[model samples]
Target: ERIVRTLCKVRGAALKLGQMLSIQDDAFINPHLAKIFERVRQSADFMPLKQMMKTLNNDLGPNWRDKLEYFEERPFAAASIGQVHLARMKGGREVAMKIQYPGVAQSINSDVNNLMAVLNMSNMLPEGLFPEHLIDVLRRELALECDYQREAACARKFRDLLKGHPFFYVPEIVDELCSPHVLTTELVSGFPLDQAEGLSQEIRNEICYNILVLCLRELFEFHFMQTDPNWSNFFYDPQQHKVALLDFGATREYDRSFTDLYIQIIRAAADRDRETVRAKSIEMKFLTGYEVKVMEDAHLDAILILGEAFASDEPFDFGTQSTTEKIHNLIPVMLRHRLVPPPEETYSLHKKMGGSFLICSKLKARFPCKAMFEEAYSNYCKRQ
Candidate 1:
């Protein structure tokens, strides 16, 4: 409770770090700790209305009120960096206006520094956690997200790429109103992913399958990924049977080498060749030769555990906790002997993979893991 309170109060990279720890069972093995940190996913300390007004005035100018048909003062959603309000333009288009918190952008560096100090002092971080490396990556991504204009551009690119995608929906950006601190987009509506508990089995299965397919496509085919995996970023539209994709602030592009190596890793894993998997992992900078040599057995065990899903000839049961539990059990042991920090790219990629698995688990959905892997690999090769 004290830890949760501290994180919620900090409410920047600290909250994000807490949320990441919550889902990354592989990193933090305690289920009780994971459950405690899970609250950070939805809990946010929103800035006061007066501060929000000041931010609006500073970014959108004093005439902001004159330009909007209607703007709600209270935000409908709030997160680590910003809060979102529902509003209509003078032209009557409904939109969600994402307003960055005052001083949040400028405080990122100090926030991360202070958070790291607090974590270290509290002795909460595990050995070999390499918090500095993780902080560097988080700092860069958070800084990028602070620039609403960049996020708008990412949304546009993602919108174009997935324009005709059958299963996903990317909201349209309102470019004219977007600024560095404020972003406006077409308001979308659907049931939040967490609210899918009562959904039909067929719908759940399809949603789960589509989520995996989209992530694989992003990694293998598009090479562009919306890497943030917050459940609120996804909405299930039972009416259209499509998922409404939200938030591109953390979208990132993968270099060809990175994408190619990951495909190699997946293929090797699917083939059940532990040696090839290790070789490919090292080639991708996931491990150094020295680290591999020192922790060969543990590393192989981790790879084989992950490869189980891909190695399956039929649909894997994601609804069950057994597979995820097994993987989680193996991860800490692997990390305890880990000698090298993972390549930076794997930070976001790992989050996406773990987050996807959690989503599938939450929905109690089952889908063909092997088929999806093969299809993505085949399509990627054809494109090349």
Candidate 2:
């Protein structure tokens, strides 16, 4: 209890490390301790009311209340970077303000470094297992998530790009109230999209259709992607029939060359052109000439299964499709065979993409996904 309390209170690497451990097999630790750590990921440690107010005063200046209505005494939600408070403006507009925890930004690098120092003593979590490059990528991402100004800008850009699109929404940024540590955006009411089991089939299909298309556009059309696909970050409003995208802190833009290679990879994978898949994989530095024959086939088979939705023009059912299990099963073989680590972008991009499918599966939604994929792809290319 003491260890968990201190780690939760610290709110950085220790908190995250505990979160990572929360899902581990309990045989490695006391079963009771393992169960307790599960709460670490599902819940958050909130700043005290006094501390939150102090932060608002420091970031928004002493007369912060004069700008609008009242800030809540308790945060409505909390994430790794900060806690979110519901507030109102002078015009009675509701907004969510996510405020960074003090010292979190400064501690990210050292926190992870200190973690590595301890792991190194055990001689297992070494360069090959948890490489320095991957560690640095995580450090950079942590720093980025802590910057509300960057996140605010990302939200604004995303809002602009998604403007006029039906069934999709972004919270308007209250720029005047935004600061380096404080982000204020209009409150968007939504429930987790995965909880759409009760929604009608037509709407559920629409939900799956819109989300998959939106993800395709973000990656191939816009080239700017919100890589955080946490179930909580995506919302479905039954009343409005809308999907709201939130938390742009992990946003990333792929270079045109990179996206083009991926477009080619997709085309090749969908067509089952093994040579191109192998060629592109090698070009991307993902597959070296070092693996055995089955190792190579496993990767090819992997991409083909991934392209299942993109290859099928008929209506596809996420509920019946075994793609998720197939992909998960494929990964272990590839993980064992591959010696080189993939590009850093691979981790963030694929997490969101794969997670989107997982949501669709949970919703038991069906749609003509191949048409949607090609439609978005060609439409964007013609625009180019």
Candidate 3:
């Protein structure tokens, strides 16, 4: 299957490529396809130790094993792009080792081009709107993500920025064990986000609130974000009352002016000011010139409805009792209007945020989002 081949060889970008197809606006169109890709997250074949060692020697040099202390050949987890191995540092610290597939970096252009070719051939996209620039952006983003150094920086920055927040957890970087192709960080354990179904309502609510607050902080305050929303990126520690963060490869920084404009748009949505939203959308490059007028007051109202869920001062019901049909009904309108979110700097942050929300929703967790947003955003937006 195409999925298997991508997973086996296209390591660095494989998971991200799967996410691009499975998530985002087109998620419901091919439900089975989305499920299929989602299933591939932890179901891929891993590189044999013999082959892995060969790769390390070839890439990290003949002295690879000597450089590492207590390196474990067996991987703790395997995914489309990379597999994580548990190891101990020479200094006696627990660490996680992430290894890239051979030739993954070398094959990016070819793989991406082939994917675009297939999508075009299949007519998945509208005719003549392939958005060549989008591919270029993806390529660039992937290139940056491929570097472990950048991801390490991202992890450091995230922890530094959110250190005061007790409800969030970011892994500490193991700088000595990191390289361009591999990353190492402290190993933290908790329940997976998707598996938190039976957790206490209070814990679930706090987790969801922390996640949403982090998102608003990213968009309105930090102007930096993690774009990937794969559910596996988060872990819930009920005892600690915190959410453990993982995978910073998809992190991004935005232009301050762009984030300011986005805050204005959110403000418009919060206040139910259609004119302000319309004007801001156009000026902020969210909805293009001609697309602006076509987005009527009703369309804006629909967005406001979702926005209210975020902006309101009450606990929004994220449970199946409350949210299933609301989202299903909103999808058709979004599709009809062709309102796909722009793959800008904030796209990944929103995706990550949405993933956390869905995890909470699936568990039917009820959280006081209204208070969390107001608390986090009030201080954050003013700082921005």
Q: Given candidate 1, what's the lDDT at residue 287? A: 61
Candidate 3: give the clashing pairs: 227-348
Tell me each candidate's TM-score. Answer: 0.89, 0.85, 0.83
Q: Between candidates 1 and 2, which one is better according to TM-score?
A: 1
Runs in model 2 lying further than 4 Å from the true structure: 1-38, 114-130, 292-295, 322-324, 329-340, 380-384
- Order of quality (lDDT): 1, 2, 3
Tell me, what's the RMSD of every candidate? 2.9, 4.0, 3.9
Worst 10 residues of 2 by lDDT: 19-28
Best-fitting candidate, measured by TM-score?
A: 1
Q: Write the residue-wise lDDT of candidate 2 on 1-384 in tens digits.
A: 444554465445644554223223222344555454555555566667777677688888887889876778788887776788888888899998888776678888777876565445545352336664546656776777778888888989999998898888898999888998888988988787646688888988888778888888887788588774555677887778788888887688866766677777777877768799778767865667666887677657767765787898888787767345544322322332234666656544455566566667778888877887778668867977
Q: Kindly list the per-residue Cα lDDT of model 1 for residues 1-384, writing each as its tens digit.
A: 467676666666865675444454444466655665666656866778898887788887787788788989889988568798999989898999888888877898888877777667666566635555567667876787688878888999999988898889798998766888888889987878877879888988888888888888888878589775756678887778888888887788967887788778778877888889878777877666665454666655655755677878776777664245544433323432344666667555655665677678778887768878878878888987
Query: What is the RMSD, in Å, between candidate 3 and the native fold over all Cα?
Result: 3.9
Could you tell me how far off, in angstroms, the CA of residue 179 lies in candidate 1 after the best superposition? 0.4
User: Clash number for every model?
Assistant: 0, 0, 1
